[PDB]
Design a binder for this molecule. Sequence first.
Ligand SMILES: CCCCCCCC/C=C\CCCCCCCC(=O)OC[C@H](COP(=O)(O)OCC[N+](C)(C)C)OC(=O)CCCCCCC/C=C/CCCCCCCC
Ligand SMILES: CCCCCCCC/C=C\CCCCCCCC(=O)O[C@H](COC(=O)CCCCCCC/C=C/CCCCCCCC)COP(=O)(O)OCC[N+](C)(C)C
Ligand SMILES: *[C@@H]1O[C@H](CO)[C@@H](O[C@@H]2O[C@H](CO)[C@@H](O[C@@H]3O[C@H](CO)[C@@H](O)[C@H](O)[C@@H]3O)[C@H](O)[C@H]2NC(C)=O)[C@H](O)[C@H]1NC(C)=O
Ligand SMILES: *[C@@H]1O[C@H](CO)[C@@H](O[C@@H]2O[C@H](CO)[C@@H](O)[C@H](O)[C@H]2NC(C)=O)[C@H](O)[C@H]1NC(C)=O
Ligand SMILES: *[C@@H]1O[C@H](CO)[C@@H](O[C@@H]2O[C@H](CO)[C@@H](O)[C@H](O)[C@H]2NC(C)=O)[C@H](O)[C@H]1NC(C)=O
Ligand SMILES: CC(C)CCC[C@@H](C)[C@H]1CC[C@H]2[C@@H]3CC=C4C[C@@H](O)CC[C@]4(C)[C@H]3CC[C@]12C
Ligand SMILES: CCCCCCCCCCCCCCCCCC(=O)O
Ligand SMILES: CCCCCCCCCCCCCCCCCC(=O)O
Ligand SMILES: CCCCCCCCCCCCCCCC(=O)O
Ligand SMILES: CCCCCCCCCCCCCCCC(=O)O
Ligand SMILES: CCCCCCCCCCCCCCCC(=O)O
Ligand SMILES: CCCCCCCCCCCCCCCC(=O)O
Ligand SMILES: *[C@@H]1O[C@H](CO)[C@@H](O)[C@H](O)[C@H]1NC(C)=O
Ligand SMILES: *[C@@H]1O[C@H](CO)[C@@H](O)[C@H](O)[C@H]1NC(C)=O
Lengths: 438, 438, 52
Amino acid sequence: YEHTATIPNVVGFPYKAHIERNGFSPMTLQLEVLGTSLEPTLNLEYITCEYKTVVPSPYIKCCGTSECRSMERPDYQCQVYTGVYPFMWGGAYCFCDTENTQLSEAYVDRSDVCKHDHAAAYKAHTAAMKATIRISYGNLNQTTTAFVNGEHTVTVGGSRFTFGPISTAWTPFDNKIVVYKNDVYNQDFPPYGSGQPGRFGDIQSRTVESKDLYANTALKLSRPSSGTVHVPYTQTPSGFKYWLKERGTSLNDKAPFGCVIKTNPVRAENCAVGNIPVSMDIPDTAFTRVIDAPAVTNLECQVAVCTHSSDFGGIATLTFKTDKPGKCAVHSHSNVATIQEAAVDIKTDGKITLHFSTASASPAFKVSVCSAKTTCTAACEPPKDHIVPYGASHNNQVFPDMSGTAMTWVQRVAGGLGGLTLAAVAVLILVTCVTMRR
Amino acid sequence: YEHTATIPNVVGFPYKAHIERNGFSPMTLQLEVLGTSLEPTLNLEYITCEYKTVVPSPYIKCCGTSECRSMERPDYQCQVYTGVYPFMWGGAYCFCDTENTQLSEAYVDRSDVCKHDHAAAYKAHTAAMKATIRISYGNLNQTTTAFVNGEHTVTVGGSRFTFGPISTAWTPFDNKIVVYKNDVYNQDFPPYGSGQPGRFGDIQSRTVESKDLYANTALKLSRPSSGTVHVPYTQTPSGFKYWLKERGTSLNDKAPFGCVIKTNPVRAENCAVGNIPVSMDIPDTAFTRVIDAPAVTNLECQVAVCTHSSDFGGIATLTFKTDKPGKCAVHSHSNVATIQEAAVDIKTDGKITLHFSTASASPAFKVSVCSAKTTCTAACEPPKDHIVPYGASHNNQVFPDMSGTAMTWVQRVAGGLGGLTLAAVAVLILVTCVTMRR
Amino acid sequence: RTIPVTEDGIEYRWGNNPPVRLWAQLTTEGKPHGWPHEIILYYYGLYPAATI
Ligand SMILES: CCCCCCCC/C=C\CCCCCCCC(=O)OC[C@H](COP(=O)(O)OCC[N+](C)(C)C)OC(=O)CCCCCCC/C=C/CCCCCCCC
Ligand SMILES: CCCCCCCC/C=C\CCCCCCCC(=O)O[C@H](COC(=O)CCCCCCC/C=C/CCCCCCCC)COP(=O)(O)OCC[N+](C)(C)C
Ligand SMILES: *[C@@H]1O[C@H](CO)[C@@H](O[C@@H]2O[C@H](CO)[C@@H](O[C@@H]3O[C@H](CO)[C@@H](O)[C@H](O)[C@@H]3O)[C@H](O)[C@H]2NC(C)=O)[C@H](O)[C@H]1NC(C)=O
Ligand SMILES: *[C@@H]1O[C@H](CO)[C@@H](O[C@@H]2O[C@H](CO)[C@@H](O)[C@H](O)[C@H]2NC(C)=O)[C@H](O)[C@H]1NC(C)=O
Ligand SMILES: *[C@@H]1O[C@H](CO)[C@@H](O[C@@H]2O[C@H](CO)[C@@H](O)[C@H](O)[C@H]2NC(C)=O)[C@H](O)[C@H]1NC(C)=O
Ligand SMILES: CC(C)CCC[C@@H](C)[C@H]1CC[C@H]2[C@@H]3CC=C4C[C@@H](O)CC[C@]4(C)[C@H]3CC[C@]12C
Ligand SMILES: CCCCCCCCCCCCCCCCCC(=O)O
Ligand SMILES: CCCCCCCCCCCCCCCCCC(=O)O
Ligand SMILES: CCCCCCCCCCCCCCCC(=O)O
Ligand SMILES: CCCCCCCCCCCCCCCC(=O)O
Ligand SMILES: CCCCCCCCCCCCCCCC(=O)O
Ligand SMILES: CCCCCCCCCCCCCCCC(=O)O
Ligand SMILES: *[C@@H]1O[C@H](CO)[C@@H](O)[C@H](O)[C@H]1NC(C)=O
Ligand SMILES: *[C@@H]1O[C@H](CO)[C@@H](O)[C@H](O)[C@H]1NC(C)=O
C-alpha cells in the first residue's frame, strides 16, 4: 500500500501515522525515533602536537677550527663560536687561550608521543544522517536503522520503509574542525605550511606516518658564556600546550538543538531539528477487514478533566454502540491534541477512556474510533509545575477553538459591531436611493 | 616581494610571469604545469558482484513427512513436495509409491570471488585539485607539487609560493560513480535495498567484510519430475555479468577537456579548464641591481618573417645599444604574441633574435629588454599544415592590429564616410543658422 | 572514417596503440595582407559565421 507521512526529528516523540485503507478497517501506526546520528565527512589536513628540541653535545675543537655543515632538518640551526675557553670540574678543557671553536647544533623533531598525544585538523562537509526507528503496528513490534535519505529501504515485517531526505542541511560543525581525544572544536586552524610559533599549528605533520615535518618555532642560538659548556638557545614554547590550556570548552557545550558531540568517528547525535519524510509500503496481511472489524456508531465525546501540560493531562470519555468486541484504531485528525494510545479494547459497555496531550486552553481535536466520527471539545487548565524534566508530548498549539470562551466573546463583539455597521450601511443606502429618487 | 599572477590550467605550457621590481633589474619567470590531478571524495555505498546459488542435496523422506524450516538466509526458499517416487540407477530409492516427501532448499550467497571480482558504487563530491609545477627563474630550476587552493604554501629556493583555488568547480564525475578495476562509469546505480533481478545491483553488500547481504534474484522452486532427484529451480541470471557485457565505454572515453580517468585512487588528471591564480614571495637575493645590469637604449623592432602557426613561427630582430654584456629579461606585455625565450645573451653587437608565437595576421605585441621599450609590428602568414600533433603555444588572439592592412582599409572607409557626414552636418548647421538669422 | 579536428583538438585511439593527440592550425585559402576581398576570404576561411 502506497502512503507517505512526515515525522518530527525528535527522539522520544510517539508520532502516530494513520492509514485509511479503503476496503479494510483503519490502522494506526507507531513511528518512534530512538536515536539519530549526523555524520560529517572528515578530510585530514595535518597533525599537531608538542615538539622536541634535540640539542646534542657540542663539539669543542681544541686549538683548531671547523665549519657549519648544512642538514635537511626542520628549523635547523648551526653556529661555530670562536675564542671559547670552557672549563670542567678538573680544570680547563681546551689547551689554548682564545684559539678554539665550539659547534652549536639544534633542531626540532616530532615528539615521541605525537603517536599518542596529538590533535587533528579536519574539514567537515556532506554530513550523512542515520537514524534508529521503531515500527510497532498491529501485532508486530520491530526496530531498524536506516540512512535518512530517499535512497535507502529497510524491510520491517514484510514492509518496505524509506526514511526520506532530511528537511534541513543544517550542521553544527563548521568548515574547519579540530579534534583532541573526545572533544571537537570549531577552530580556524592555520593553513598548512603557514604556522606561527607559540600558537596552534606551530609544528605541522600531514600524517602520523609522515616523514616530512614542518616546524616554525623561531629557534635562536647564542654565544656560550666564558668557561661553560651549555649550548645556550632561546626558543618559543610549544603552541600545542598553549592551545591545550587555552582551548576552553568544546562543541559539546555550545552545540545548538541539544546536539551531543562524540568522536570515533566524529558525529552529532540526537539533534532536534527538521522533519523526516516517511514512505510506507504495507502489504494486505497487516490490515483487517471491516466484516471482522466491529461497527461503531453513535459516538459522542464528552470531557471530564483536561490540563494542557507537557504530558497527557487531558482525559477523554467516549460513548458508542458496537456489535462485537475487538480492537479499533484511534487517531486525532487535528494537531491541537495527540492521543497517547493508538488502539484501545472495544467491548459491549460502549464506554472507553482516552489520554491526550494538548497545549491550548480550548482544544478542538477530532477522534475517529474504527470508522466512526465525533468532535471532542474541552476546556483545558493551566498546569501546576513551572518546570518539568520531560519534553512536551503535544504539537504546541495555543490557538483556542473557534467556539472557545475567548473566541466566543471576540465573535460576540465582532457580531455586534458588524450589525451596527450594516445597519448604518443600510440606512445610508436607503437615504442615497431616496435622494436619487427625488 | 609581493606579486600575484594568473596562469592557464594547461599542461606542457610555460607561463612567463614578469616582475617589475622597482630598485632592481626586471626578472621574467617560468611557470610550467607538469601535471594536475582532480581528486574526488568517494563514499562507498555497496559492493556488487556475481552471486552463487547454493542448492544442497535434497532430503528424501522415504515413507514419512517433514515440515519446512525458516532460515535467516538471503533469498531463502524452502518448498516441500508430497507423493514423490524417485529412481536411482539400481532402482527405486523410496519404499511406498506415493507416501513420500522431498525437501527442496535453495538460497543466494556472496560468490567466492566477490573478494576478487566486484564493482563498487560510490558518491563523488568535493573534488580536491593537486598540480605539479616547475619554477625556473634566474639561476635556479626546481619542481614542486602543491594542492591548488589559497591555503597551501611550498618553499622553492627560499620563495613562498601559494597557488590559489581552481577558477571553476567543474568536475567530470557525477554524483553516482561505479568503479570496476581501472574503469569509472557515470551510472545511476539503484539505491541500496531496492535492487531488481537481472540488473546491476541485484545483490548488494555494504562492505567486502560485510556479513549482511541483500539479494533479490526472484528465485523459484518447482516440483521435481517423476522418478528423478534434481531439485528443479528457475532463477534470474546475474545482473553483474549483464552489466559487464552491457557496460560499454567508461568515463575515460567521454570525459570533457581531455581528462584522463585513472583509479587507485579514482582521479581525473590533466584536465584543461580554468585558471590557477599564483601568489609569489620572492626575496631580494634573486633579483639583480641595475648598476650591475646593462643599460639598454635605442631599441627598435623590425620583423623579417612571421607565421601564425601553433608553434613559435614568428621571428623578431631587435637592435639596441648597451654598455656592458650580460642577461636581460624579455617579456611581451600583450597577449597577441608570446616570446619563446625569457632571457637572452646581451652583448656588444647590439642585435638579438627572438622567437614568438602569434595567432593574428597583423600582431602588435610590445617587447621590453631589461628596462628598454619598443613596439614590434609584423604581418604574419597563414601556415602550412592543416593538422599538427602539438597544441597552440599562443593565446589565440585573431584581432588584427589597429594599424593592420584590413583595419587600415576599414579606417580609411570610415574616415571618408565621417568626413562626408561632417561636411553635410556643417552645411545643414550653417543653413539653419542663416535661416534663424533671417 | 572522417574525423573533424578543431582548435581544441582531438585524441584518437585505435586498437591497443597508445592514444594520439592532434590539433588543427589556422589554415585557409585567403590572402592576409592583399586586397580587401582577399582579406574577407582570409577571415572567412577561419571563423565563418562571425565574419559573415
Ligand atoms: C480586546 C479584544 C482583543 C482581541 C484580539 C484579537 C482576537 C481575534 C484573534 C483571532 C481571530 C481568529 C482568526 C484567525 C487569525 C489569527 C490566528 C491566530 O490567532 O493564530 C494563528 C496562528 C496559529 O497559532 P500557532 O499556535 O499555530 O502558532 C504559534 C507558534 N508557537 C505557539 C509554537 C510559538 O498564530 C500565529 O502563528 C501567530 C504568531 C504570532 C502573531 C503575532 C501578531 C499578533 C496578531 C495576531 C492576530 C490577531 C488579530 C488582531 C486583530 C483582530 C481583530 C479582532
Ligand atoms: C564601419 C563598420 C562598423 C560596423 C561594425 C558592426 C559590428 C558587428 C556586430 C556583430 C558581429 C557579431 C560577431 C561578434 C563580434 C566579435 C568581435 C570581438 O569579439 O572582438 C574581440 C574583442 O574586441 C575588442 O576587445 C574590441 C575591439 C573591437 C571593437 C570595435 C572596433 C572598431 C570597429 C570595428 C571593426 C570591425 C568591423 C568592421 C569591419 C568590416 C568592414 C568591411 C576580438 O578579440 P579576440 O581574438 O579575443 O576575439 C576572438 C574571439 N576568441 C579569441 C575568444 C575566440
Ligand atoms: C698541542 O699543543 C700545541 C701548543 O703549542 C698546539 O700548538 C698550537 O697549534 C695551533 C693550532 O691552531 C697553532 O696556532 C697557530 O698560531 C699561528 C701563529 O699565531 C696562527 O696562524 C694561528 O693561531 C695558528 O692556528 C699553533 O701551532 C700553536 N699555538 C700555540 C703555540 O699556542 C698544537 O696544535 C697542539 N696539537 C695537538 C693536536 O694537541
Ligand atoms: C515494543 O517493545 C519494546 C521493547 O520491549 C517496548 O519497549 C519497552 O517497553 C516496556 C514497557 O512495556 C519497558 O521495558 C520499557 O518501557 C521499554 N524498553 C525500551 C525502551 O527498550 C516498547 O514499549 C514496545 N513498543 C510498543 C509496543 O509501542
Ligand atoms: C630546467 O630543468 C628541467 C628538468 O631537467 C628541464 O627539462 C628538460 O628539458 C630537456 C631539454 O633541454 C629535456 O631533454 C629533458 O627531458 C627535460 N627534463 C624533464 C622534462 O624531466 C627544463 O628545460 C629546464 N628549464 C629551464 C632551463 O628553465
Ligand atoms: C580589408 C577589409 C575591407 C576586410 C574586412 C575586415 C573584416 C571583414 C574582418 C576584419 C577583422 C575580423 C574579425 C576579427 C576577429 C573576430 C573574432 C572571431 O572569434 C570571429 C571572427 C571575427 C569577428 C572577425 C570577423 C571579420 C572581421 C571583422
Ligand atoms: C436587518 C433588518 C432589515 C430591516 C431594515 C429596516 C429599515 C429601517 C426602518 C426605517 C428606515 C428609514 C431611514 C431612511 C430615512 C428616512 C428619511 C428620508 O429618506 O429622507
Ligand atoms: C572642414 C572645413 C571647414 C570649412 C567649411 C567651408 C564652408 C563651405 C563653403 C560654402 C558654404 C555655404 C553653404 C550654405 C548655403 C548657402 C546658401 C544659403 O545659406 O541660403
Ligand atoms: C446591532 C443592533 C441592531 C441593528 C439595528 C440598529 C438600529 C439603529 C437605529 C437606526 C438609525 C435611525 C434611523 C434614521 C437614521 C437617519 O437616516 O438619519
Ligand atoms: C466597496 C465600495 C463600493 C464599490 C463596489 C461597487 C459595486 C456596487 C455598486 C454600487 C451601487 C450602485 C447602484 C446605484 C445606486 C447609487 O447610485 O447609489
Ligand atoms: C570627404 C571629402 C571632403 C569633404 C568635403 C566634401 C565637399 C562636398 C560638397 C559640398 C556640398 C555642396 C554645397 C552646397 C550644398 C547645399 O547647400 O545644397
Ligand atoms: C544629437 C542631436 C542634438 C542633441 C544635442 C543638442 C546640444 C547642442 C545644441 C543644439 C544647437 C542649438 C544652438 C542654436 C542653433 C539652432 O537653433 O539651430
Ligand atoms: C542519543 O543517540 C543514541 C544513538 O544515536 C541513542 O541510542 C540514544 O538513545 C539517544 N539518547 C536519547 C536522547 O534518547
Ligand atoms: C598527466 O598527469 C600526470 C600527473 O598528473 C603527469 O605526470 C603527466 O606528465 C601528464 N601528462 C601530460 C599530458 O603531460
